[PDB]
Design a protein around this ligand. Structure first.
Ligand SMILES: [Mg+2]
Ligand SMILES: [Mg+2]
Ligand SMILES: [Mg+2]
Ligand SMILES: [Mg+2]
Ligand SMILES: [Mg+2]
Ligand SMILES: [Mg+2]
Ligand SMILES: [Mg+2]
Ligand SMILES: [Mg+2]
Ligand SMILES: [Mg+2]
Ligand SMILES: [Mg+2]
Ligand SMILES: [Mg+2]
Ligand SMILES: [Mg+2]
Ligand SMILES: [Mg+2]
Ligand SMILES: [Mg+2]
Ligand SMILES: [Mg+2]
Ligand SMILES: [Mg+2]
Ligand SMILES: [Mg+2]
Ligand SMILES: [Mg+2]
Ligand SMILES: [Mg+2]
Ligand SMILES: [Mg+2]
Ligand SMILES: [Mg+2]
Ligand SMILES: [Mg+2]
Ligand SMILES: [Mg+2]
Ligand SMILES: [Mg+2]
Ligand SMILES: [Mg+2]
Ligand SMILES: [Mg+2]
Ligand SMILES: [Mg+2]
Ligand SMILES: [Mg+2]
Ligand SMILES: [Mg+2]
Ligand SMILES: [Mg+2]
Ligand SMILES: [Mg+2]
Ligand SMILES: [Zn+2]
Lengths: 118, 38, 134, 175
RNA sequence: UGUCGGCUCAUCACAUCCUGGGGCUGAAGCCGGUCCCAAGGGUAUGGCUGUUCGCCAUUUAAAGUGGUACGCGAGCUGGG
RNA sequence: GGAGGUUGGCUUAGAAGCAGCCACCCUUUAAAGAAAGCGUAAUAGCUCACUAGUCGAGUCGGCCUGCGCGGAAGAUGUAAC
């Protein structure tokens, strides 16, 4: 368990720091994916440009204070697979179409292209 | 059943219970870990 | 179904423990792919390639170019590792043969991004003596 | 007391009568669930049913969670009939349901006849499956445990009557 | 206040030899090992030796271990 | 979910995180020890340690001390107020 000192009060800020650099964000219920299948997906953020990660739900809701994806407060529940797209505005939800094409998972809760509640 | 003056856990599945004034060990993995008295 | 096939010859069952296993793949079936597994598929060495079944006893073969110790032995030429770590050394080279080895070895079998496979490739030989400084 | 503070939240069609500590619940497909609560118990009636302890005694705390569990069983029972599944493993093992008598073949010289007490009924969709089905858990579970005790499972072949959800330990003779 | 052994007649405990009920087993079955509960009833004949014991022969479901003035001579014997 | 270098090396036909001896890295991240248990002849296969969601208020262990429980079986009759 992360303590409030070593982490849990710094990694909350880092995603908020990286929040104010992106144009799109697709949140998916990434539960049940194999380590290789995620790795195959994880070998795409370095190619097309993405900030895909998973964080605590409560920290994520407290990480939007920078006014980047405030429209996701009502959807900040369940599993999280935040996929901030900074370079090449968008271009990740298209990969999500490729990512969810071969899987039954990736329900994809919402997309945050600019100010937009999906 | 093993009856000893010193009864205790032998694995992570063993439980200490008090059943009608007697200390017992019941295990759901090995039936060799059953114990009485102590 | 993780397994191994001898390059250029699949008939030997004791060499691979064929027949009995997770699936029922034919022993003589893999002999055809053994021709494809030669020269560039670790000739003379037991390259391990896993197996899979499509419907019943398929011939789904794999490919592993060069393992880290296989590459380390190829890059060093030594005969064996050290039985006692941090006690015996055999001799190593600079951290430059690893870059060309990892570039060939990783390909898609490693998730390393940049100089990340350098630690992974050196990891297998890290405890086998032959300390490296440059 | 997490179990005690939890309300029952009775379903739509259920009839509840509270003549003091004694309680009676009516429902579909079975009724007349009579119970008595120990004098240390308060059953307060509202949009649902709640349970609380009068005293601060340690035994009174224990019985608060027992009454909540018991009442929740009566409510579910008169709305969904509790059931247990048994299955027979072994060659020549058969179960036949004939009204209120159950006949089992379990490898004895004599077939055994089991008399079902009033209330529950037994059903055998196959020759190796038994469905005990009633409205109160204690009677359903006691009857299923009595059938199982005719020949419980054994470790070498797994033969004998067992619960459907039961995990049977298995072993083999050495060498 | 008569001291070993035998005969006759016993009575009690349970730390159970058989029969009864169980758990574990390195318990397939038939046999076993070990521990728990249980004292209702049972529990050899002989060769040698004064012997109790012991060793042998052949039985039996089994041939229990101890207390009772190492039970019992105003009940017998008299080999030591 | 609980991964790849990586059947770690030595030896062993082979002993592959789980035959014995040396120290016990690093990429991906949410996680992972050259791996704690049961395992295969050896593989393989169920776990666990660690982490994500879920339900929403307490919960975990140690120390000092009062009174109690087990350990606790005998011979005529309860018979160790
Ligand atoms: Mg009882
Ligand atoms: Mg007496
Ligand atoms: Mg006794
Ligand atoms: Mg006995
Ligand atoms: Mg026994
Ligand atoms: Mg004893
Ligand atoms: Mg007796
Ligand atoms: Mg007797
Ligand atoms: Mg008697
Ligand atoms: Mg008596
Ligand atoms: Mg009687
Ligand atoms: Mg005689
Ligand atoms: Mg004589
Ligand atoms: Mg006999
Ligand atoms: Mg006597
Ligand atoms: Mg005398
Ligand atoms: Mg005597
Ligand atoms: Mg005389
Ligand atoms: Mg005399
Ligand atoms: Mg005389
Ligand atoms: Mg006299
Ligand atoms: Mg006299
Ligand atoms: Mg006289
Ligand atoms: Mg004389
Ligand atoms: Mg005491
Ligand atoms: Mg007594
Ligand atoms: Mg006494
Ligand atoms: Mg007396
Ligand atoms: Mg007495
Ligand atoms: Mg008195
Ligand atoms: Mg008095
Ligand atoms: Zn145990």
């Amino acid at each position: 368990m992360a303590i409030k000192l070593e982490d849990k009060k710094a990694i909350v800020a880092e995603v908020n720091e990286a929040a104010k650099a992106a144009l799109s964000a697709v949140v998916a219920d990434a539960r049940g994916v194999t380590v290789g299948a995620m790795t195959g997906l994880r070998k795409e953020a370095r190619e097309a440009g993405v900030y895909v990660k998973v964080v605590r739900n409560t920290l994520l809701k407290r990480a939007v204070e920078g006014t980047q994806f405030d429209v996701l407060n009502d959807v900040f529940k369940g599993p999280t697979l935040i996929a901030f797209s900074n370079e090449h505005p968008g271009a990740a939800a298209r990969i999500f179409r490729e990512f969810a094409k071969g899987q039954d998972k990736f329900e994809i809760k919402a997309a945050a292209f600019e100010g937009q509640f999906l | 059943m093993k009856v000893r003056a010193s009864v205790k856990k032998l694995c992570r599945n063993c439980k200490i219970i008090r059943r009608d004034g007697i200390v017992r060990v019941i295990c759901s993995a090995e039936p060799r870990h059953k114990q009485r008295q102590g | 179904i993780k397994l191994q096939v001898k390059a250029g010859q699949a008939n030997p069952s004791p060499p691979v423990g064929p027949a009995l296993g997770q699936h029922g793949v034919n022993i003589m079936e893999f002999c055809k792919a053994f021709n494809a597994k030669t020269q560039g598929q670790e000739p003379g060495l037991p390259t391990p390639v896993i197996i899979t079944v499509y419907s019943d006893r398929s011939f789904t073969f794999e490919t592993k170019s060069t393992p880290a110790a296989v590459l380390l032995k190829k890059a060093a030429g030594i005969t064996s590792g050290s039985a006692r770590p941090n006690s015996q050394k055999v001799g190593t080279v600079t951290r430059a043969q690893l870059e060309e080895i990892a570039k060939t070895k990783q390909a898609d079998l490693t998730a390393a991004d940049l100089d990340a496979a350098v630690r992974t490739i050196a990891g297998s030989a890290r405890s086998m003596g032959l300390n490296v400084e440059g | 007391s997490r179990v005690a503070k939890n309300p029952v939240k009775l379903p739509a069609g259920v009839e509840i009568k509270l003549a003091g500590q004694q309680l009676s619940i009516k429902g579909a497909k079975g009724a007349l669930e009579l119970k008595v609560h120990p004098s240390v118990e308060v059953i307060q009636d509202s949009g649902e049913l709640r349970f609380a302890a009068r005293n601060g005694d340690q035994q009174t705390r224990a019985m608060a969670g027992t009454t909540r569990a018991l009442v929740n069983n009566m409510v579910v029972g008169v709305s969904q009939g509790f059931e247990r599944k048994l299955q027979l493993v072994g060659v020549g093992y058969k179960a036949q349901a004939k009204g209120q008598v159950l006949s089992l073949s379990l490898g004895f010289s004599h077939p055994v006849d089991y008399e079902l007490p009033a209330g529950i009924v037994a059903e055998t969709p196959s020759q190796t499956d038994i469905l005990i089905k009633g409205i109160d858990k204690q009677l359903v579970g006691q009857v299923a445990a009595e059938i199982r005790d005719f020949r419980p499972p054994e470790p070498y072949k797994g033969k004998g009557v067992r619960y459907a959800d039961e995990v049977v330990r298995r072993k083999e003779a050495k060498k």
